[PDB]
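Deliverable D2.4 — example input (structure tokens):
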């Protein structure tokens, strides 16, 4: 990106402007959900064995801090402190969409993929890696979080596995009205999760599969909910500038009361790159059934718990990068 400074030190000014139109079943078109941002990333190498990083990223709305990081890289790994995305969000899984996928990735149900005071660790060797994180609860003002993932690449097959636990002692589930007493439903909820992923590259094709489990339990309550999830997705480079993509996502939710639900999400889309600094995309999404909540990494959208009936959805977008 825009190198302001460069030597043993570099200062990089970077960002994205986005314009996105969303057409959701039974709604008027929405313009302006596009997640634009701008930041600065400063790096300095002290020697062969030690480097420092300072990064800050703001949303372009009014303006507010998205990430704010101090980093220390050493021969025994990299340690990063401050307001960061979760390690679970960085590793992600087999969702290749720009708008509607991610329903089978179950790490974000409570956290929305962010904790304002974390320490994150990364170790890399050859093709092999370890990534971990911990969130400081601040005498209960912030959630509890602890995560660990490992992965490697063996020829054309890349694999990873891991997970964690995320606790929110006062999570807002929703609201109830009984006569004229309207009241918030809040609970002490823990989300415990684990996943395995494989991604296979063959020529112009990429195919991925992710399995996820999660367990939601409530501290002073017999209620437990288990989720079992599969995501099957791929991409295909049909020309130098042009990539097609598609996925199928199925999730079953089972409560210890015996209540069962499930949800299906299918997407198909196309990406076109004008240049390294410009691209556009268009996507169709078909949803049926239930989600307890998910995050689409591509667009940064959060979808709260919901049920839909045979819903047809479309998105179109364009981005500028520097
Ligand atoms: O995450 C922060 C940067 O990580 C650099 C190395 O990533 C290697 C493996 O990546 C796959 C899981 O993200
Ligand atoms: C191969 C070891 C399996 C480890 C399972 C840990 C599961 C923790 O529960 C998360 C999903 O529920
Ligand atoms: C006991 C925990 C061990 C988990 C580590 C990885 C297990 C092997 O992973 C291979 C990656 O598989 C991705 C998931 O689905 C593969 C099943 O489908 C095979 C046909 O595509
Ligand atoms: C490892 C590659 C898997 C191939 C895709 C199938 C995944 C389907 O999940 C099994 C659980 O299904 C229960 C409901 O299935 C409804 C009809 O499914 C259409 C098959 O894609
Ligand atoms: C699904 C739309 C894909 C358009 C890809 C362009 C590939 C160039 O070959 C001829 C296109 O004919 C349409
Ligand atoms: C030249 C034949 C090689 C066979 C590669 C597999 C083709 C099947 O598609 C793989 C992934 O497709 C993504 C679909 O996107 C639309
Ligand atoms: O709010 C509606 C947003 O719709 C997005 C697409 O459908 C996602 C819901 O599907 C998950 C349940 O199957
Ligand atoms: C594979 O491509 C998936 C979409 O990734 C680009 C999305 O980037 C944006 C984060 O808000």
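Example output (designed residues):
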């Amino acid at each position: 990106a825009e190198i302001l400074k460069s030597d043993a030190g570099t200062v990089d000014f970077y960002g994205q402007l986005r314009t996105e139109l969303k057409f959701l079943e039974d709604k008027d078109p929405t313009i302006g959900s596009g997640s634009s941002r701008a930041g600065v990333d400063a790096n300095y190498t002290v020697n062969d064995s030690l480097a420092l990083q300072g990064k800050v990223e703001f949303a372009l709305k009014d303006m507010y801090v998205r990430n704010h990081i101090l980093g220390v890289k050493t021969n025994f790994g990299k340690f990063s402190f401050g307001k960061q995305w979760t390690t679970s969000d960085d590793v992600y899984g087999a969702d290749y969409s720009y708008f509607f996928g991610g329903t089978g990735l179950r790490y974000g149900t409570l956290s929305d993929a962010l904790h304002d005071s974390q320490v994150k660790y990364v170790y890399e060797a050859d093709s092999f890696w370890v990534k971990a994180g911990y969130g400081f609860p601040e005498d209960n003002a912030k959630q509890e979080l602890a995560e660990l993932y490992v992965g490697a690449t063996f020829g054309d097959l890349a694999v990873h596995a891991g997970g964690g636990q995320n606790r929110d002692k006062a999570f807002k589930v929703g609201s109830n009205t009984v006569g004229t007493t309207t009241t918030d439903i809040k609970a002490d909820v823990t989300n415990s999760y684990f996943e395995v992923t494989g991604e296979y590259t063959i020529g112009d094709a990429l195919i991925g599969v992710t399995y996820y489990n999660a367990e939601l339990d409530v501290e002073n309550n017999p209620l437990v909910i288990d989720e079992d999830a599969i995501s099957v997705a791929g991409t295909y480079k049909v020309a130098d500038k042009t990539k097609l993509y598609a996925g199928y996502e199925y999730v079953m939710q089972e409560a210890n009361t015996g209540a069962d639900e499930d949800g299906t999400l299918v997407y198909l889309g196309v990406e076109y790159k004008f240049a390294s600094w410009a691209r556009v995309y268009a996507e169709y999404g078909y949803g049926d059934g239930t989600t307890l909540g998910y995050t689409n990494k591509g667009s940064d959208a959060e979808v709260k718990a919901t049920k839909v009936d045979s819903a047809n959805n479309f998105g179109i977008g364009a981005r500028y990068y520097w």
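The longest strand covers residues 157-178.
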